[PDB]
């Protein structure tokens, strides 16, 4: 009412800025009708980089192409993609990409995507590359909210609800960008922390031998029990529940948490991870923390949870 | 006198025990790291020729 100051932080590459987009574009100031202006170049770059990285990792993982002739195609690509402009996908590119994806050898590498680094949304994109390459394509809103870009600077967002004045800040999730968090620490009313549920068998970009769940837990425990934010409250968010639902059956939980036992379901391990993410709080009854699942690309759950969050902020 | 020697040799059993378990922990603390560094360096010296 008088003022509300929200800060968004969490592990890098967790979908923090997807919430900023899913709020601003959907609700206040209207959507971006001329979305192509940026989305063309952005999606073209993403779809090119993904299929470049997969073929670069093919040699490292020693998987051999399904067919002999395929060995030629990739080479051509790696030569003809260097001298191309940005935000352009000529037919010579699309034909090669579709032919390469039409193989039983690349599937072997794509099944094991934990070892190396690829963008997660790319698996949805490239399958319909033709839809992009056809002239006049204007992206769908679901396709609009699955783009990817590095949230780097501090940006002010003004949500509106319950007749309040809102100011939302967000910051980069890399180690270097963590210095900038100190400026916005002073004089806040609430804090929001973001966690990605899918990343229990991955590694950091900066450091190749550090797990991601452990990194998130160590980041959380530091500010959770600090006295600078004793007065304020903390709101926890869980993203990427869809890929979590997909993956959780594929691989065990023993790799991340060594002493787990049982059989994994979409809900059996959820309470496991939540209780292990909330035990770190020192003040057991002095302060309370709330965590909610969330699919950032969707809008139904966003509407379900954001209004309740704002109401809980109001209640105090 | 000698009685004080008897007293010392009687009440030194509560320190012969405290000081000895403080010594074993140090040896354990060093052996663990000596094993670990050899294993992790052997991981990285057998990856490629260079």
């Amino acid at each position: 009412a008088r003022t509300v100051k929200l800060l968004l932080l969490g592990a890098g590459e967790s979908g923090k800025s997807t919430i900023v987009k899913q709020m601003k574009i959907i609700h206040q100031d209207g959507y971006s009708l001329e979305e192509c202006l940026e989305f063309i170049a952005i999606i073209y770059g993403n779809t090119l980089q993904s299929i470049l990285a997969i073929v670069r990792a093919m040699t490292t993982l020693n998987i051999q192409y399904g067919d002999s002739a395929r060995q030629d195609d990739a080479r051509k690509l790696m030569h003809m993609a260097d001298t191309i402009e940005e935000g352009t996908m000529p037919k010579e590119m699309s034909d090669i990409i579709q032919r390469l994806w039409k193989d039983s050898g690349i599937q072997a590498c794509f099944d094991r995507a934990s070892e190396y680094q690829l963008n997660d949304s790319a698996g949805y994109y490239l399958s319909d590359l033709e839809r992009l390459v056809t002239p006049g394509y204007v992206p769908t809103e679901q396709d609009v909210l699955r783009s990817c870009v590095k949230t780097t600077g501090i940006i002010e967002t003004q949500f509106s609800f319950k007749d309040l004045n809102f100011r939302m800040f967000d910051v980069g999730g890399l180690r270097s960008e963590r210095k900038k968090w100190i400026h916005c620490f002073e004089g806040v009313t609430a804090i929001i922390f973001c966690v990605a549920l899918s990343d229990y068998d991955m590694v950091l970009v900066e450091d190749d031998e550090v797990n991601r769940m452990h990194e998130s837990m160590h980041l959380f425990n530091s500010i959770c029990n600090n006295k600078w934010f004793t007065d304020t409250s903390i709101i926890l968010f869980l993203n990427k529940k869809d890929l979590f639902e997909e993956k959780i059956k594929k691989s065990p939980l023993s790799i991340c948490f060594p002493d787990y036992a049982g059989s994994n379901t979409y809900e059996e391990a959820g309470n496991y991870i939540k209780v292990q993410f909330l035990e770190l709080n020192m003040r057991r009854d002095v302060k309370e923390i709330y965590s909610h699942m969330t699919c950032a690309t969707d809008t139904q759950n966003v509407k379900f949870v954001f209004d309740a969050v704002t109401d809980i902020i109001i209640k105090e | 006198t000698e009685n004080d020697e008897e007293i010392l040799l009687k009440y030194l059993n509560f320190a012969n025990l405290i000081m000895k378990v403080f010594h074993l922990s140090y040896l354990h603390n060093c052996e663990t790291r000596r094993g670990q560094i050899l294993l992790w360096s052997g991981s990285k010296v057998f990856e490629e020729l260079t």
Binding site: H218, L219, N221, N226 | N29, T32, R33, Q36
Partner: protein
């Protein structure tokens, strides 16, 4: 006599069933989950706990955590 357990052949067991064997150790990491409440002998070795780096670099703001938000 009979060793007070009344068994002489070999180890006996109440249960029966199919054997279960262990999986190999494929991937390794330098990291462990943050520490629990209580500690015992042999749980302070440098380099065997944490993320391999001091907490200062991961959380720079925690450096001067003594001074409050006034400044």
């Amino acid at each position: 006599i009979r060793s007070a357990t009344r068994v002489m052949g070999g180890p006996v067991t109440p249960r029966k069933g199919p054997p279960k064997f262990k999986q190999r150790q494929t991937r390794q990491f330098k990291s462990k989950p943050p520490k629990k409440g209580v500690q015992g002998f042999g749980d302070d070795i440098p380099g065997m706990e944490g993320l391999g780096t001091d907490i200062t670099v991961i959380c720079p703001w925690e450096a001067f955590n003594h001074l409050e938000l006034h400044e």
